[PDB]
């Protein structure tokens, strides 16, 4: 599985961002590959956080990703405030 | 010295 | 289709918010509103599920709290990028 190993290092990558999240540049520059290739990744990672069993999707906003909570989960985290 | 990141708290917001 | 899916991605998305304080084993299972040996059950295949190689974050327990934390294999990348550390 390839670009298994790849895939998690933009996971982690996004995850240690926060809100703030990262370019294309700048996950391409650390997984040390072209900007497609990342974005390649990045897409799949999408794909993979669309299914219902995770918790967390990968949306594009200002020309940066970053992880967040999907809005479908919110009652529950209003009861965390709580 | 075996590095693992954790990441802030989201926004706590009204919610 | 799987029943407990949701209440998985729940949990997901709760440690998620939860960020570096983690949360208890009792906090998550009030806030499902399920037994503590559920939400067990739930959290533990979740951790599981963070297992593989494909993944990148892994569901650690310490100081009392589950939380979500970087796999120390990737390191390496997270260095060439404040935040927050546990080693």
């Given at each position: 599985?390839?670009?298994?190993?790849?895939?998690?290092?933009?996971?982690?990558?996004?995850?240690?961002?926060?809100?703030?999240?990262?370019?294309?540049?700048?996950?391409?520059?650390?997984?040390?590959?072209?900007?497609?290739?990342?974005?390649?990744?990045?897409?799949?990672?999408?794909?993979?956080?669309?299914?219902?069993?995770?918790?967390?999707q990968?949306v594009?906003?200002?020309?940066?990703?970053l992880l967040a909570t999907?809005?479908?989960?919110?009652?529950?985290?209003?009861?965390?405030?709580? | 010295?075996?590095?693992?990141?954790?990441?802030?708290?989201?926004?706590?917001?009204?919610?």
């Amino acid at each position: 599985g390839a670009l298994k190993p790849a895939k998690a290092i933009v996971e982690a990558l996004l995850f240690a961002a926060g809100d703030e999240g990262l370019s294309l540049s700048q996950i391409a520059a650390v997984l040390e590959v072209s900007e497609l290739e990342a974005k390649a990744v990045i897409e799949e990672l999408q794909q993979d956080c669309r299914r219902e069993e995770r918790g967390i999707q990968l949306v594009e906003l200002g020309g940066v990703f970053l992880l967040a909570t999907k809005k479908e989960h919110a009652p529950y985290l209003k009861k965390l405030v709580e | 010295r075996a590095l693992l990141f954790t990441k802030p708290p989201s926004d706590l917001s009204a919610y």
